[PDB]
Enzyme design. Structure first.
Site, PDB file in Angstrom:
ATOM      1  N   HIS A 104      -7.640   8.017 -26.291  1.00 24.62           N
ATOM      2  CA  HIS A 104      -7.723   7.133 -25.135  1.00 24.62           C
ATOM      3  C   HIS A 104      -7.340   7.924 -23.887  1.00 24.62           C
ATOM      4  O   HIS A 104      -6.672   8.961 -23.968  1.00 24.62           O
ATOM      5  CB  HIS A 104      -6.814   5.900 -25.306  1.00 24.62           C
ATOM      6  CG  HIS A 104      -7.136   5.071 -26.516  1.00 24.62           C
ATOM      7  ND1 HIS A 104      -8.309   4.355 -26.643  1.00 24.62           N
ATOM      8  CD2 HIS A 104      -6.441   4.853 -27.659  1.00 24.62           C
ATOM      9  CE1 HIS A 104      -8.320   3.730 -27.808  1.00 24.62           C
ATOM     10  NE2 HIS A 104      -7.198   4.015 -28.443  1.00 24.62           N
ATOM     11  N   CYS A 148     -12.105   3.504 -21.540  1.00 22.41           N
ATOM     12  CA  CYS A 148     -11.043   4.292 -20.919  1.00 22.41           C
ATOM     13  C   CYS A 148     -11.617   5.350 -19.983  1.00 22.41           C
ATOM     14  O   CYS A 148     -11.192   5.475 -18.827  1.00 22.41           O
ATOM     15  CB  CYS A 148     -10.204   4.966 -22.016  1.00 22.41           C
ATOM     16  SG  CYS A 148      -9.039   3.877 -22.797  1.00 22.41           S
TER      17      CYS A 148
END
Ligand SMILES: [Zn+2]
EC number: 3.4.19.12
Length: 340
Positions: A254, A12
């Site tokens: 994330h 991410c």
């Protein structure tokens, strides 16, 4: 329209970094036209970043697989692990510093585009002497806990603290103990100002880091004048151009990105934004930035209201300096255009 970046596991942080870099025209062009030299320090990383940018700009596919770039990337221990969630700020700083180290040309471009200078002053109140030291930066760390907005954060970065009583300063010039006023101020600001909106506190009872999910706002138009060296002891107004959002905890969180299209003009006048989330890119209604980025409470039905603080909020803010007065020409090398 826009190409995503395939998550290789827990990458991410890479996708958010590369996409915001890619969407900064000055940075995209400096990568494409980079001058190679036989003994340059990050040569393969350069080529793989050029290919990534080339693929993002010209690929008919929907996502680039950034595996070749990761396999050439070294951060501290020699490889870049595909399954560990690195801090996004650290990776952004690591990449930018690699680019700076590639060549004198790129160092100059990067220091102007992303780099700034903080001055740490201490002014004695009981002698004539002053101390001032310079501190370069690429990102500004902004405390979110107990702050309502980014101006209160910058008031804290720029706070004038007085060393008194037990905390008396020792002047190095006359060797005396003195009261003094210590203050950080911005001497030089980059064209692209990056703020890490930091939401972690050390709970020294758990001996762990905990995320703060309170409300914290930030404006579309930011005036940095009250934090500048001139004011305290080129334009200082900025426009928001991107937000990296973090959701979840420090451990199992994330990242994804809301980014403004500042490349395409007849679309920059229409204030078009996009949500870059790994391989998925789609238009974003920027009237929703507050909802998606400011944190704070929301409610839902359980029949009664059930209240909770949003775990998604701004992690990094990207601001672009306002310039009084284009359609961009990107020069991809002929060989890379062949490859793509
Ligand atoms: Zn002194």
């Amino acid at each position: 329209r826009f190409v995503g970046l395939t998550n290789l596991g827990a990458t991410c942080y890479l996708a958010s970094t590369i996409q915001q870099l890619y969407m900064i025209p000055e940075a995209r062009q400096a990568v494409f036209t980079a001058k190679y030299s036989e003994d340059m320090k990050h040569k393969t990383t350069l080529l793989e970043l050029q290919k990534m940018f080339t693929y993002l700009m010209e690929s008919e596919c929907k996502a680039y697989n950034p595996r070749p770039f990761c396999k050439t990337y070294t951060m501290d221990k020699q490889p870049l692990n595909t399954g560990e969630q690195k801090d996004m700020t650290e990776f952004f700083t690591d990449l930018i510093t690699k680019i700076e180290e590639m060549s004198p040309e790129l160092k100059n471009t990067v220091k102007s585009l992303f780099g700034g200078v903080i001055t740490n002053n201490v002014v004695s109140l009981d002698c004539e002497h002053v101390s001032q030291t310079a501190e370069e930066f690429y990102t500004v760390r902004c405390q979110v806990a107990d702050m309502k907005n980014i101006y209160e954060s910058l008031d804290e970065v720029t706070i004038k603290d007085t060393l008194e009583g037990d905390n008396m300063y020792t002047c190095s010039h006359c060797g005396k103990k003195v009261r003094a006023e210590k203050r950080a101020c911005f001497k030089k600001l980059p064209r692209i100002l990056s703020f890490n909106t930091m939401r972690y506190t050390f709970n020294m009872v758990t001996m762990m880091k905990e995320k703060v999910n309170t409300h914290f706002s930030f404006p579309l138009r930011l005036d940095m004048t009250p934090y500048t060296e001139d004011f305290l002891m080129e334009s200082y107004e900025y426009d928001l151009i991107g937000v990296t959002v973090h959701t979840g905890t420090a451990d199992g969180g994330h990242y994804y990105s809301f980014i403004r299209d500042i490349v395409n003009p007849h679309a920059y006048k229409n204030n078009k934004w996009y949500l870059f989330n790994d391989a998925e890119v789609k238009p974003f209604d920027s009237a929703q930035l507050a909802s998606e980025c400011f944190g704070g409470e929301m409610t839902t039905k359980t029949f009664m209201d059930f209240s909770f603080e949003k775990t998604h909020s701004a992690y990094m803010l990207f601001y672009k300096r306002m310039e009084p007065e284009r359609e961009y020409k990107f020069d991809v090398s002929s060989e890379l255009l062949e490859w793509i």
